[PDB]
Amino acid sequence: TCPFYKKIPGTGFTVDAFQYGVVEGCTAYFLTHFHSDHYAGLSKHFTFPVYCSEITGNLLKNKLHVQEQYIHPLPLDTECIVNGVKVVLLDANHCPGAVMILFYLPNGTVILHTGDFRADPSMERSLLADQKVHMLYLDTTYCSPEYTFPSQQEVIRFAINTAFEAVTLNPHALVVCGTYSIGKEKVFLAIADVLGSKVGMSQEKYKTLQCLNIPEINSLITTDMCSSLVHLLPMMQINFKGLQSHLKKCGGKYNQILAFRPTGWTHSNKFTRIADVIPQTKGNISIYGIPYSEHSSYLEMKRFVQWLKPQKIIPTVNVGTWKSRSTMEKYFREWKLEAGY
Template structure:
């Protein structure tokens, strides 16, 4: 087996390096169902047929933790795939689970809760706490969910799923789940977001990125350096050349510098940052630190942040609106009417407001650099739309794939049309060809 050598640690991106959800507008709606009859088996470097199914076997080699699996009581035999009955309170599979959410040769499904109980699946992984991934989970759910601690905290706190069904896996530590070796790696996406590195008994290695933003620090993950990934399930939200946008740090610096300048010129400036239930933490924490202020959150958002188990964050957040110069509001409230109303509530402290809307949806191709981004202004209120994305840009995807050089790539986003699938296939083929030519690798 080919290996990469290096001393990098998978903790290069820590869970407390908080990310956000959302980025630039994708070509198709994220999570759109795959068209019936159109299967994208991935891009393979093998000239022969690609094996979709892999044989199981004994894979516990010792030296790592073992996690027991509580199997769902699903009756075997005679059950049709489209049966809408219920088992143990869960609806049976009501619509077909896409192939890219299941790992061949295992009984694993990834982010597949909206399909009810999936035939042949006993173990359900949740890569992160965003609704398009945990959709289908509710208080009465009896799926046995495997995730890391942050995501588990959010599932139990926000969805009220019973603790007995939430199985916490450590980060950067190989464990055994249902007889298969599994390692969770930081996905650089949002709090608790994880990639799944799976080692199958037949020697195959699978990496499922979930949602992620590829970062050069991942090239130092010793778990990836020490193995050869055959199959890559890839977050292809922005797998098209037009999706080129700034790094997170560039955008954070823009927001921090702008806020600092505004407050320096007028100390009575209130700074507002938009957010989702989970997301935008890096931005508003940076604003608080540069201004030497706390961040005020709604009680619900405050409780969510406490699930992240970060002492640094706990010291920066408050629910006292008058005790903080940085306020976090729901993204949908960031318009002039709502912001004027919000500012008027604190007129004794502030007479100006600058707001940051950190979502790639507002990014314009006409802007060559983040420094060129201008606010929309109405009276004493300014709103900056900043291109802060938690999904990989096209160039970041290319770099990651060319570094990893998997034998097969399976896209997990924008697979709903034949045209988008073929376009992604062409990208993968070009990237891998370039990578192998650059490394003088033969036989592709």
């Protein structure tokens, strides 16, 4: 059964609620982004209206074979009417096609659902600036002060500089980047651009990337692995065994692997600066864990909420334990008392 925090009161609407069968009284199903925990249950046999971004709708059609007649893509930053209710989709600064949804209820209540997001000060000048929000359904993934990480820009600088140094020292080194879902494409695209290579990958991943409206993409990616010195592989294969095996497959073109695993947070964030990050090495294979996050840090989250000043917060992440729930409620109260709303 669908949990309360996926239901929008006063509407016939649910958000990211595809794994519960037919939800009683739901006339339109919203999908914030194409990540498996959120789309779980969608397929070609789904026959209710799905509302989402253009990019999410490309993935629905091509990857999950959802029929076109049930996909309703909406433009961003545009007031739209759905089953008699005004809605707006906003960029969520998560993975490609990820949105936040503003709902303007018939009784005058305004609700913001963040989906998954990385809060940014740029959001303070979207259509959010123009009215009050009563209820906030918040991505609380990293809602504790131990969760610090660098900007995305500093992380990409580290990766570009690392890869360029390595391959300039040894022109026979291969760079490998791990992936298991959409998001974080900047990691591998930035490295390929500094090395003047295309990124090589499986046909299934190439298909996924061709759905994302990334400009000049035919220029940056390929399925011809032999022509590329940046290869993408499944995240599970980013280990010394899986990388030794891959190196064998390249037929003596290469004699070294430098590999990147973009994680969210790891506890080496509490001690080490990005400048100071070092790899795990075995023989001619080095593996770097880099803290590239597409969720809010604690401080980014706090600033957004203290700016927005909602009357009520509903967490959508870490809601399964009493200890988590109590911790989050304590922070929301601190934030409110410090800011004075």
